[PDB]
Paper text:
Oligopeptidase B (OPB, EC 3.4.21.83), an enzyme belonging to the prolyl oligopeptidase (PREP) family, has recently emerged as a virulence factor in [name] and other trypanosomes, and is a potential therapeutic target. OPB hydrolyses peptide substrates of up to 30 amino acid residues in length, after arginine or lysine with a preference for arginine and most efficiently after a pair of basic residues. The overall structure of TbOPB comprises the typical 2 domain α/β-hydrolase and β-propeller architecture that is present in all members of the PREP family structurally characterized to date. A short N-terminal segment (residues 1–87) and long C-terminal segment (residues 436–714) together form the α/β-hydrolase domain, whilst the region in between (residues 88–435) forms the β-propeller domain.
TbOPB was cocrystallised with the inhibitor [name] to investigate the structural features responsible for substrate recognition, specificity and catalysis. Electron density was visible for all active site residues and the covalently bound [name] inhibitor. The catalytic triad Asp648, His683, and Ser563, form the charge relay and Ser563 has reacted with the P1 aldehyde of [name] to form a covalent hemiacetal transition state analogue complex. The oxyanion is stabilized by hydrogen bonding to the NH group of Ala564, the residue that follows the catalytic Ser in the sequence, as is characteristic of α/β-hydrolase enzymes. The oxyanion is further stabilized by hydrogen bonding to the OH group of Tyr482, as observed for LmOPB and the related PREP and DPP4, but not AAP that instead has another hydrogen bond to a main chain NH. The primary specificity for a P1 Arg is provided by specific interactions with Glu607 and Glu655. The main chain carbonyl of Arg650 also contacts the guanidinium group of the P1 Arg, and additional specificity is provided by a π-stacking interaction with the side chain of Phe589. The P2 carbonyl is hydrogen bonded to the important Arg650, and this interaction is also conserved in PREP and AAP. In LmOPB the P3 Arg interacts with Ser523 and Leu617, whilst in TbOPB an alternative conformer was adopted, resulting in interactions with Asp214 and Lys208 of the propeller domain. The TbOPB-[name] closed state structure aligned with the equivalent LmOPB structure with a root mean square deviation (RMSD) of 0.59 Å for 588 CA atoms.
Residue numbers in the entry:
A (entry chain G): 1 to 4
B (entry chain A): 5 to 714
The structure:
């Protein structure tokens, strides 16, 4: 919270 | 051989494109190139030609996965016997209640239960089952709950959010339909106003960006909700939170290198909507805000070249005055964030490449006292700790909740008195299957990067393997975003270490293990190639120190770590015999140029933006798909998910077809596509474990190790  | 998709010519453009938004300063005239496999992208996930191609791949996969079905089975059971099927979590005070989660032995989803303040947590007469995820998941392929939010004081209304396909868009609903309100298209976060009168949520956007914060009032059609805050800047996402005392709401914007906050007064009720700017965004400046009562703002920030952070103290009324510094910036200490309570604050961060945690008290003056900083003591030299904030529900509290772990020690949660120092266990994790810590040891080597830099390696192995000869090893990597792969306990690796293998985490730059700079200078933008070269360095160290040889060495990455895998197989494929890449970010140029793919504009401030001269060539030199070439690669399994809102399904799909197309070796490249799940899934079940088992099976198969040491 928010990524690869 | 294997499936190879057909080439259909499509030009992809890099630079300026009328009508589209390719960033502040894009190339002109633009550059073009052919991507013969562009078609594999369908935004609607419905194309017949595509779905067909995925069948071919599903066929190939199943056809080639027959002879590990039986080992993956022996390994699922190990998993189960390590997992503890009937369980309770670590119960925490939230108001007039103790809250906790529960698992039951046949069942795939947690229960969310509640017990009144002064009673005893456990299945019983006192226990109200707030949500039963199994009843939610009833005859559905996919089911994830984002949030379970009861409404302050009472906890009569409880709201929750649910995604049914995994593209990570949520509806918000209420338990047992006590009320009829529904909220569609949200990020999942629910934050409450006072007295259950209303709450706050966050809608997605074009390309699934979190760009808006809204109020929802009970008794109303979503259509009547008031949007409080938009950020229109494609580089940013909006966040939202509640102050300790719950009288203040916190709205922010976060790009990768820049922040902004606002405040809203909840003491003035549902029709009061005017915000209070904190410090206007200034490029390069990041900062996070936490309230103490209604007036004092406690700001963690990187301003004035304080890269690892400094925590400042200011007033609501003069919120740009940051001359008062509570905790000053230290070169060797990173501060990742603060939590603030009535009587103190927890700082979470880093020193010596391990997680650390400090506490700060008020003085006799009733104002925060620099001189009261205490660093919290832990027993093992190499460990992992975080404060659990999702369990600190009480502003007046004196007990602070921590999760503590090491690659040797199964997890513990426990309370600790901020003042006294004393540590009671709340829950210690039990591991069956005859496991014991004393069978394992974990030490830290250091590899040498081509530029002299020392890259840390964390490793664990069964104490009884022979170290006087090479051993089969798995080397795992991340390391983007500033995210650190922790040396914490994880049962998931027991199947490897139980068979005489060495499990190993490469702490590459891009990570934040060694401080914020390990990421911002070391591994990002025009120094992103270190991620890959540091990794390669760790692996050469493993070989020349004699721990392993490449025929016995494997590697694993996921998401951005998939990127790491794909680059590293492009460069030094000879170092590995077998390789896992789950949900792998690999079609870098193509995705990164295009604003419509769900995470691209955020990450123009991570890898760079290839619509720009500054970044085109560099990214090209490591983009995995773009660097596939005629040479041997090792056995590789790729795991993808159809509704993956983070790494698009088509990405690994192309990379798998291109590998098979160009590769001159004859090892297997299998690609597992769960058409039911997203990014994180594989699944939200016992099927997660099933999925994970084939992965280990595939590797152990290729390593030629099957036999436990007990």
């Amino acid at each position: 919270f928010r990524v690869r | 051989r294997g499936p190879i998709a057909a080439h259909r010519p499509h030009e992809v453009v890099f630079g300026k494109v009328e009508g589209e938004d390719r960033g502040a300063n894009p190339m002109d005239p633009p550059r073009r190139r052919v991507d013969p496999l562009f078609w594999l992208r369908d935004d609607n996930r419905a194309d017949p030609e595509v779905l067909a191609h995925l069948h071919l791949e599903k066929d190939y996969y199943e056809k080639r996965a027959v002879d590990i079905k039986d080992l993956a089975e022996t390994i699922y059971q190990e998993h189960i016997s390590h997992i503890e099927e009937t369980d309770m979590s670590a119960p925490y005070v939230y108001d007039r209640f103790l809250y906790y989660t529960r698992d039951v032995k046949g069942l795939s989803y947690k229960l969310h239960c509640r017990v009144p303040a002064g009673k005893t947590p456990g299945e019983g007469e006192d226990e109200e089952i707030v949500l039963d995820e199994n009843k939610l998941a009833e005859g559905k392929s996919f089911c994830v709950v984002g949030c379970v939010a009861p409404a302050p004081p009472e906890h009569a209304l409880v709201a929750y959010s649910v995604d049914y396909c995994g593209d990570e868009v949520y509806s918000i609903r209420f338990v047992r339909d006590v009320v009829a309100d529904k909220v569609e298209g949200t990020n999942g976060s629910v934050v409450w106003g006072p007295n259950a009168e209303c709450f706050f949520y966050i809608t997605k956007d074009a390309s699934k960006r979190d760009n808006k914060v809204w109020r929802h009032i009970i008794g109303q059609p979503q259509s009547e909700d008031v949007c409080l805050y938009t950020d229109d800047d494609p580089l940013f996402s909006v966040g939202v939170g509640r102050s300790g005392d719950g009288k203040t709401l916190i709205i922010c914007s976060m790009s990768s290198e820049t922040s902004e906050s606002h405040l809203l007064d909840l003491r003035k009720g549902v029709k009061h909507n005017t915000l209070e700017m904190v410090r206007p965004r200034e490029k390069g400046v990041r900062y996070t805000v936490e309230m103490h009562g209604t007036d004092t703002l406690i700001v963690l920030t990187n301003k004035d070249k304080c890269v690892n952070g400094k925590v400042v103290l200011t007033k609501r009324s003069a919120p740009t005055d940051w001359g008062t510094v509570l905790i000053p910036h230290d070169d060797k200490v990173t501060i990742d964030d603060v939590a603030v309570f009535a009587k103190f604050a927890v700082l979470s961060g880093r020193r010596d490449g391990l997680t650390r945690v400090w506490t700060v008290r008020l003085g006799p003056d009733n104002l925060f006292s620099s001189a009261t900083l205490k660093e919290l003591h832990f027993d093992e030299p190499v460990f992992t700790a975080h404060v659990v904030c999702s369990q600190m529900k009480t502003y007046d509290a004196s007990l602070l909740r921590l999760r503590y772990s090491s690659m040797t020690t199964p997890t513990v949660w426990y309370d600790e008195d901020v003042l006294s120092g004393e540590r009671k266990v709340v829950k210690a994790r039990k591991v069956g299957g005859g496991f014991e810590s004393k069978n394992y040891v974990c030490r830290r080597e250091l590899a040498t990067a081509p530029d002299g830099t020392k890259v840390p390696i964390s490793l664990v192995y069964d104490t009884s393997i022979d170290l006087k000869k090479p051993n089969p090893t798995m080397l795992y990597g991340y390391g983007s975003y500033g995210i650190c792969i922790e040396p914490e306990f994880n049962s998931r690796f027991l199947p490897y270490v139980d068979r005489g293998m060495i499990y190993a985490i490469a702490h590459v730059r891009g990570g934040g293990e060694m401080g914020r700079t390990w990421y911002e200078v070391g591994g990002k933008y025009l120094t992103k190639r270190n991620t890959f070269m540091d990794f390669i360095a760790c692996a050469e160290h493993l070989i020349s120190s004699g721990l392993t040889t490449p025929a016995q060495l494997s590697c694993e990455g996921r998401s951005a770590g998939g990127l790491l895998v794909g680059a590293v197989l492009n460069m030094r494929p000879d170092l590995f015999h077998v390789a896992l890449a789950g949900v792998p970010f690999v079609d870098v140029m193509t995705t990164m140029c295009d604003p419509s793919i769900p995470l691209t504009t955020g990450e123009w401030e991570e890898w760079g933006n290839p619509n720009e001269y500054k970044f085109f060539d560099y990214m090209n030199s490591y983009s995995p798909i773009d660097n596939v070439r005629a040479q041997d690669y090792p056995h590789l399994m790729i795991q993808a998910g159809l509704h993956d809102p983070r790494v698009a399904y088509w990405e690994p799909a192309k990379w798998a077809s291109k590998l098979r197309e160009l590769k001159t070796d004859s090892n297997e490249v299998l690609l597992k596509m769960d058409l039911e799940s997203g990014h994180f899934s594989a699944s939200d079940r016992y099927k997660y474990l099933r999925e994970n088992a084939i992965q280990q099976a595939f590797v152990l198969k290729h390593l030629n190790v099957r036999q436990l040491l007990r």
